[PDB]
Structure 1
Amino acid sequence: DDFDTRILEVRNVFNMTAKEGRKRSVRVLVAVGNGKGAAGFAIGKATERADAFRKAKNRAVHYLHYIERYEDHTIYHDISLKFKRTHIKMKKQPRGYGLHCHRAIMTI
């Protein structure tokens, strides 16, 4: 009951089926966390989007990371990280400075 989930990205994805012509799937990328430092995310995909929200929920509890927080708010030290054509950079702030981030990263 402690785990909140947020939908990061819902997307309409298509395929080519000999029978049907186009075939429409929905894929949602979803994250989950308790606020206490452990959290994770997963992808899920289904024909009906409701189904897919469900799928990502459950699969995401299965991958959790523990995220270590300094004095239980910031990160410990600056992080500059290049991952696959995307660069992430994050500075460790003091207390009055709430969450200045990409909207996704705020959510996470």
Structure 2
Amino acid sequence: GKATDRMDAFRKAKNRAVHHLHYIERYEDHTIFHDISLRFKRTHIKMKKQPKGYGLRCHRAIITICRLIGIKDMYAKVSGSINMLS
């Protein structure tokens, strides 16, 4: 959400996100199904499926997104350009 006022940007972004919902498949409703190593543009994301109780040992943004998704246990290393949007 991009706006002149911060509150307007918050409202725009949060109202427009719900029209762009992904459904994230989870394994046993606590983790991802397999290790996912990908590169988006200049950012490498390497995610490891972990057993229960391992927790979210991920980048802070990834911790937030995983809490939103409903992923409890996962490891994640971000390499290359640490760009929030990428």
Q: TM (normalized to structure 2)?
A: 0.74
Kindly report structure 1 stretches of 4+ aligned residues shifted beyond 2 Å: none
Deviation at 1:93, TM superposition (A): 0.2
Q: Out of 37, 43, 57, which is 1:86 matched to?
A: 43
The residue that corresponds to 2:55 in the other structure is 98
Q: What CA distance in whole angstroms lies between the structure 2 residues aligned with 1:99 and 1:56?
A: 25
Unaligned runs of 5+ in 2: 66-86
- The structure where strand makes up a greater share of residues is 1
Deviation at 1:96, TM superposition (A): 1.4
Percent identity of equivalent pairs = 88
1:58 paired with 2:15, answer: yes
* Aligned twin of 2:81: none
Scaled by the length of structure 1, the TM-score of the pair is 0.59
Bigger radius of gyration among the two = 1
Superposition RMSD in Å = 0.5
Task: Tell me: higher relative CO, structure 1 or 2? Use CA pairs within 8 A at least 6 residues apart.
Answer: 2
Q: Whose helix fraction is larger, Structure 1's or Structure 2's?
A: 2
Match of 1:74 in 2: 31
